[PDB]
Design a binder for this molecule. Structure first.
Ligand SMILES: Nc1ncnc2c1ncn2[C@@H]1O[C@H](COP(=O)(O)OP(=O)(O)OP(=O)(O)O)[C@@H](O)[C@H]1O
Ligand SMILES: Nc1ncnc2c1ncn2[C@@H]1O[C@H](COP(=O)(O)OP(=O)(O)OP(=O)(O)O)[C@@H](O)[C@H]1O
Ligand SMILES: Nc1ncnc2c1ncn2[C@@H]1O[C@H](COP(=O)(O)OP(=O)(O)OP(=O)(O)O)[C@@H](O)[C@H]1O
Ligand SMILES: Nc1ncnc2c1ncn2[C@@H]1O[C@H](COP(=O)(O)OP(=O)(O)OP(=O)(O)O)[C@@H](O)[C@H]1O
Ligand SMILES: Nc1ncnc2c1ncn2[C@@H]1O[C@H](COP(=O)(O)OP(=O)(O)OP(=O)(O)O)[C@@H](O)[C@H]1O
Ligand SMILES: [Mg+2]
Ligand SMILES: [Mg+2]
Ligand SMILES: [Mg+2]
Ligand SMILES: [Mg+2]
Ligand SMILES: [Mg+2]
Ligand SMILES: [Mg+2]
Ligand SMILES: [Mg+2]
Ligand SMILES: [Mg+2]
Lengths: 506, 74, 62, 491
């Protein structure tokens, strides 16, 4: 690899990419951040993996937290650090002050600590080191001058020793100065900021690598999530554009539509179904999921508008029994509120269920449901996510977008996502004779040829009935069309008088 | 208690003591604190945060003359 | 013990929900806020729902 | 006293409504705020109402203005404090330093003072005590931690004494700390905050009860006025939705219009006349106000666009003579540019005047005239106040609104008062054969049935003359019609 600084891997879902490899060996990385941001876990997680993946003993210095707790807490992610502090792979080095302490002790002890840590590192033969909360040490009676010299000593000596170290720093403001003494930022070789920005009463955490002296890396923020498995990052921008494409074709669950799409949706293709409220989108999606299970393949449905129960009531009324679908273990309905978390999370909940079930199809009813509150870019970037994941995974996607203005919407995007999408399906009302009739249309298909009519469709207990086109109507799209006739009575089946039979017999 | 003539450091070390001793007893304790600006620091003396095991914030956000009471678990 | 962190219930409608069980055991939970936001009542009421629901004596320092 | 918190009403118009009773008896309240918010007045008005209403001796303590002055100024709201000093019902415990002096007298006096306090409390058998500018005391050479103790010593003692208190505190930023040292904050049982907010080079006074230990209250800010009769707080949120409703009817000034609205307007109801500039809203108001002068009834007219004079003119031009309407003290016109004040001061003028003329009808010449230069929310609130007041008072109300765009306007209102008005009379220019003709319409009436046609009308020296609808046209509402000239059924 073309870099001149040797790196070691953190094995932290995401980091090693953003850091183009992992922390520079024989160096100190300052992972700083607000209260509760993720800091100390990173640290612990950093020593952990080294142990359980490279068999590299690690030395963890605690400053504020009690050596007991660090183990007690780290059990949340499912790690028996105890057992490691026990097998001689992880040496927790207490330095926490005492409940009956004096006052004054942070200079000669800073000299003693070096030798300290230097003992355990030589003793346990360690490669990785964590120094959690150095800050607290200066929080006794210090100022900028004495902090840069004192830190420096520690890192300077540490580097000489050959240990790949991580220090943690607290900071009051999320975007302002990196660290408290606004001095740690230049004493370290690397600087890993961790934030947890608020905005819209929700909470968004992000990781950013300001600098990595010696090599390159991904710049700016990247969202991460602390799950039962610890830190989890999304290089939404490291998501290269090299997915696979195939001319394979699958069903839509709606026959006539299939034709309308050159012969059935492409396996590898994103599908968009936009249409004013009450046009039908939800249905089709259900008919898409259904069929996927009627061919014996898995598929998920993430409902953000309707309940799991109701999704079935209206689903059954349209025929297709979801009750069974669930039972045969072929269709899985998630179903939740977009307000019950930030996108980062929602994007991961979805990803998860896509790995504990391995669908071969997926449908997200109302992307626009997720665009609530959130900023366009934030939402657009999330769309690229799901869309991204499903694309490189051969998993057919059908997204649902509901335009905020029925009849008269000059744009079926509203959030402008129609260019990331491969194939769009359009549903819109049509005002014909004091009646709200429906009508579907196939706008685009990147690989197919698809029908160019704006056919009308009707909903029955049976489903989507794709009838005929409003040829003799102008200003269609306008919603309330204009009837201009050159014909209509034209053949097709003239023959007047008695043409029908009735219910008795024909 | 710190409002007698104390500064950040003095106050952090003190919270530590207090909290810790309380940790030993095995006492599930709750500690109330004052602030200065609805979104400003989390505790009067810019330290109380990192020193606690768990932190909670009760906000009475202003806005259009109507106050809105929220609670968060940092 | 040798598992996760055990929690206690505050029986405060909602909070025991938002906190996934409630305050951690044998640990202090900081609750700060501006004048007139909650705190005391949140402390009083945590004590109260203690006695009045599991019979767990309370100590209030003021 | 094993009972809920006990409060003592302040008889300060609006406050006892916001505190849900009034500052908790025997405890300490903290009204703080920047220079020129109310403070000194408040406490003064606090003690006054306490005496001239319940014979409750008052103990006022000054730390800066000389007792002589507190009186002098007080006479501003018609109350000789000197009288109660003579009557021993109020004691202005002077505590202001003199031209000369020394120093190093820290907690030194804060102690001796608590005795001089307790002194008059016992002596004058006090109950309500107020301390103005307490902070102007620690402004000698102290720090936060120092004030917290000099303050708590007091309040504490005071609660012992048992007298109900209020402490004046100053502030520098209208929305920053609650009190100079951000300590007093927590040292109080109740924190009130007077805010004299700027914005648009205009000033709005807003009071708020941040906290009241042991009792519920009113969350949020409230606008308040400072007049000749003390402070006044309109709890525009507090006002309840229990308005009296009758099925009686009233005339609109225009017969043919009374017909349209199926009998007329309901005495108890708000009506809104909307249209582009010129449509003739001011007419309908002029006509609506004479009718109440035919049934010899007092009606008021609030103009915010035309003058005393000009109105008289354009009025005698429509036939109706106002010159007599005034003489017969059955009609009162106001007039004042919207700019001359803010909605807070307005709402009041209205109220006050309605009390000194006992109207039975009323019409405000243009609301948009008043929505001028103010935030929708701020205006939206001003409607509901008058709208509300005119309602639970039985006064039929008619408000004017010039829509921001003639022809095709897609809403009777912009500010969105549509859902706040019962009846909606809609005026709108209509273009026919190259001439700007009118069109009146009863858009909505909650009770009656009203006419559903869009009838054109015209303006002559005899007033409005509603006519026939545009039966033969199309797109009428849009503004620029389109005759149908349908060729019959073509034989
Ligand atoms: N199993 C878990 N699932 C989800 N979140 C978790 C889990 N365990 C811990 N967390 C979260 O991890 C965070 C704990 O932060 P951490 O111990 O990593 O150090 P810190 O935030 O960097 O520093 P400090 O000690 O000052 O809080 C909390 O915000 C908490 O909600
Ligand atoms: N059993 C049924 N019989 C006839 N028509 C039905 C039936 N069920 C639903 N419909 C029709 O289908 C529409 C319901 O919309 P649908 O559930 O397909 O999702 P949508 O229009 O995409 O999104 P949303 O319903 O959330 O607005 C209704 O407008 C209605 O006319
Ligand atoms: N019975 C009640 N019903 C409704 N609201 C109440 C009641 N009692 C108090 N309150 C509200 O709670 C607030 C009182 O605050 P509380 O005593 O709970 O402690 P705090 O706000 O955390 O701290 P502080 O001592 O600075 O007020 C008041 O400002 C008021 O709005
Ligand atoms: N008769 C009056 N009519 C209308 N407004 C008045 C009258 N008298 C006083 N005011 C207004 O009320 C304010 C008086 O405030 P007051 O002296 O009561 O106390 P404060 O502003 O709270 O504190 P401070 O002593 O620092 O001024 C003035 O700023 C003024 O605008
Ligand atoms: N003597 C008159 N004879 C004929 N028409 C008149 C006479 N006086 C007024 N008008 C008509 O009435 C209009 C005057 O407007 P009016 O007094 O009704 O108030 P408005 O339209 O509601 O509001 P604004 O005057 O601010 O535009 C003129 O534009 C004109 O068409
Ligand atoms: Mg923390
Ligand atoms: Mg930590
Ligand atoms: Mg739907
Ligand atoms: Mg409190
Ligand atoms: Mg004063
Ligand atoms: Mg307090
Ligand atoms: Mg006009
Ligand atoms: Mg006018």
């Amino acid at each position: 690899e073309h870099q001149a600084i040797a790196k070691m891997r953190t094995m932290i879902e995401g980091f090693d990419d953003i850091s183009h490899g992992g922390l520079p060996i024989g160096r100190s990385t300052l992972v700083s951040g607000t209260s509760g941001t993720g800091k100390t876990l990173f640290s612990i997680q950093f020593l952990y993996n080294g142990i359980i993946e490279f068999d590299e003993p690690g030395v963890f210095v605690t400053f504020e937290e009690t050596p007991q707790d660090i183990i007690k807490n780290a059990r949340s992610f499912g790690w028996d650090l105890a057992k490691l502090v026990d097998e001689g792979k992880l040496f927790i080095l207490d330095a926490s002050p005492d409940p009956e302490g004096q006052e004054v002790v942070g200079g000669f002890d800073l000299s003693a600590l070096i030798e300290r840590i230097n003992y355990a590192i030589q003793k346990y033969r360690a490669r990785r080191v964590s120094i959690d909360s150095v800050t607290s040490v200066f929080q006794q009676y210090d100022a900028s001058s004495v902090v840069r010299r004192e830190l420096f000593r520690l890192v300077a000596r540490l580097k000489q020793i050959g240990a790949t170290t991580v220090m943690t720093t607290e900071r009051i403001e999320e975007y302002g100065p990196i660290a408290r003494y606004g001095v740690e930022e230049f004493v370290s070789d690397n600087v890993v900021i961790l934030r947890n920005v608020l905005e819209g009463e929700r909470r968004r955490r992000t990781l950013e690598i300001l600098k990595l002296r010696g090599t390159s890396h991904m710049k700016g923020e990247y969202p991460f999530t602390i799950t039962d498995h610890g830190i989890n990052i999304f290089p939404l921008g490291a998501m290269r554009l090299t997915q696979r494409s195939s001319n394979v074709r699958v069903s839509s669950g709606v026959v006539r539509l299939d034709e309308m799409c050159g012969g059935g949706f492409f396996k590898d293709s994103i599908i968009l179904a936009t249409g004013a409220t009450g046009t039908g989108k939800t249905l089709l999606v259900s008919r898409f999921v259904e069929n996927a299970c009627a061919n014996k393949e898995r598929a998920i449905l993430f409902a953000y508008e309707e309940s799991r129960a109701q999704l079935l009531r209206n689903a059954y009324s349209w025929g297709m029994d979801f009750e069974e679908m669930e039972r045969q273990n072929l269709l899985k309905i998630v179903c939740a509120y977009p307000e019950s978390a930030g996108l980062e999370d929602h994007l991961q909940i979805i990803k998860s269920e896509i790995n504990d079930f391995k669908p071969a199809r997926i449908a997200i009813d109302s992307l626009s449901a997720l665009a609530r509150g959130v900023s366009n870019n934030a939402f657009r970037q999330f769309v690229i996510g799901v869309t991204g994941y499903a694309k490189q995974e051969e998993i057919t996607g059908l997204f649902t977008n509901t335009s905020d203005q029925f009849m008269g919407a000059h744009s079926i995007t509203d959030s402008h996502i129609a260019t990331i999408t491969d194939t769009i399906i359009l549903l819109q009302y049509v005002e014909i004779r004091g009646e709200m009739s429906r009508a579907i249309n196939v706008f685009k298909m990147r690989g197919s040829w698809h029908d160019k009519a704006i056919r009308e469709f009707m909903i029955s207990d049976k489903g989507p009935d794709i009838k005929d086109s409003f040829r003799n109507f102008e200003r269609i799209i306008s919603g309330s069309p204009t009837r201009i006739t050159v014909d209509e009575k034209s053949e097709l089946s003239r023959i007047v008088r008695g043409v029908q039979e009735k219910g008795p017999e024909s």
